[PDB]
Amino acid sequence: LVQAVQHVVIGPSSLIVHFNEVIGHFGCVYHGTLLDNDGKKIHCAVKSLNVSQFLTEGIIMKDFSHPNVLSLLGICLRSPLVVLPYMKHGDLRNFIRNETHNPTVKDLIGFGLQVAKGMKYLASKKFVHRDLAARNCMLDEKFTVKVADFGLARVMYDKEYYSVHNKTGAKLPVKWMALESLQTQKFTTKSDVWSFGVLLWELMTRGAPPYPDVNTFDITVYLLQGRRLLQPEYCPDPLYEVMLKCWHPKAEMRPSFSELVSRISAIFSTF
Ligand SMILES: CCOc1ccn(-c2ccc(F)cc2)c(=O)c1C(=O)Nc1ccc(Oc2ccnc(N)c2Cl)c(F)c1
């Protein structure tokens, strides 16, 4: 493990944490400066963790290289610190909810296509996300969407959406979970497809909360009855058909991420 983690570990002398520049219970995010031995100084975001599994997550994230997936600059051991490239426009949900922003109907479909591309890359590597949602996607200075996971850093802020299992300790985002995951607590690439369907609905409503009139406990019965999220006012009919296929009760009937990239590219560029 020590030899395997060598390329991910950053020395404490190489990282400058700007503690008086907070970005945002389980950890704080601050502005930072990373001192690169072979290039220019890097502006970063540093997340503090208030151990063996953590370093293996570091090795997996360091192997990611795709314009639609958040990369890892490294990990600093001394509380442990996670070093990420800085994302100028924060999370995707807060960006589209901002009343001073004017994304077009095509721009919103475009953000959906970017997520599908990042997920197609992850699924080809057999990586299961388990928490795909607009709040976990980042936006850089060039408006490029980066698929990521805050982990436990926003569970208290997003307390309305998260359940924590009393036995396994698992993070459970009930209103983004596939029917079979709510019944078995098992996650697959096909249950990530269901979550992507919910993410598309969030984009086309500019960040509205899903099922606002349905109790947490009533979600399983609501879904077994065959009921689903309603078509947003400015969501095109072919894009709603895509959402409905992502929510099929049989995991095997749901489209692959390759089929999603193809259908959304058609919707995005065709009239
Ligand atoms: C090493 C363990 O951590 C992981 C592990 C896996 N993945 C992961 C999981 C699935 C994927 F597909 C890809 C990556 C992660 O995303 C993280 C993580 O820590 N992400 C994280 C994200 C945003 C943060 O906040 C920022 C950052 C930059 N700019 C601004 N403005 C803000 Cl607010 C932040 F601090 C930390």
Q: Which of 31, 46, 75, 84 to mutate to test the pocket of ligand 1 (most atoms within 8 A of CB)?
A: 84
Tell me which residue of 192, 269, 196 sits closest to 236, measured CA to CA: 269
Say if ligand 1 is within 6 A of residue 76 CB.
Answer: no
Say if ligand 1 is within 6 A of residue 81 CB.
Answer: no
**DSSP state, residue 170:** -
Shared-domain flag, residues 31 and 99:
no
Task: Supply angle C-alpha 146, 151, 154, rounded to 5.
Answer: 95
Q: Is 36 noted as a catalytic residue in this protein?
A: no
Report whether 203 contacts 195 (CB < 8 A). no
Shared-domain flag, residues 47 and 147:
no
Shared-domain flag, residues 96 and 23:
no
Last residue of a domain, one of 86, 106, 131: 86
Shared-domain flag, residues 62 and 98:
no
Report whether 140 contacts 87 (CB < 8 A). yes
The label of the residue with tokens 């709040």 reads: 135
Supply the DSSP string of 44-91, one letter for each residue.
EEEEE---HHHHHHHHHHHT---TTB----EEE----EEEEE--TT-B
Residues 58, 252: Cα–Cα separation, whole Å: 31
Phi (first) and psi of residue 34, to 5 degrees:
-100, 125
Shared-domain flag, residues 124 and 242:
yes
Give helix 237-246 / helix 257-269 axis angle, nearest 10°.
Answer: 170
The alpha carbon of residue 167 and the mean position of all alpha carbons in its chain are separated, in whole angstroms, by 25
Q: Tell me the two tokens of residue 34.
A: 């990373």
Shared-domain flag, residues 212 and 131:
yes
Tell me which residue of 152, 144, 188 sits closest to 50, measured CA to CA: 152
Shared-domain flag, residues 5 and 69:
yes
Type of residue at 48:
S
Last residue of a domain, one of 86, 115, 136: 86
Residues 93, 97: Cα–Cα separation, whole Å: 6
Shared-domain flag, residues 245 and 172:
yes
CA end-to-end distance (rounded Å), the chain: 52
| Structural domain boundaries enclosing 266 | 87-271
Shared-domain flag, residues 210 and 251:
yes
Say if ligand 1 is within 6 A of residue 84 CB.
Answer: yes
Shared-domain flag, residues 174 and 73:
no
Shared-domain flag, residues 23 and 46:
yes
Q: Annotate 236-267 with three-state secondary structure.
A: CHHHHHHHHHHCCCCHHHCCCHHHHHHHHHHH
Shared-domain flag, residues 197 and 239:
yes
CATH of the domain at 111: 1.10.510.10
Tell me which residue of 163, 164, 156, 162 sits closest to 28, measured CA to CA: 156
> How much distance in Å is there from the Cα of 82 to the middle of ligand 1?
8
Total of domains in the chain: 2
Last residue of a domain, one of 86, 101, 129: 86
Say if ligand 1 is within 6 A of residue 87 CB.
Answer: yes
199: enclosing H helix or E strand:
helix 189-204
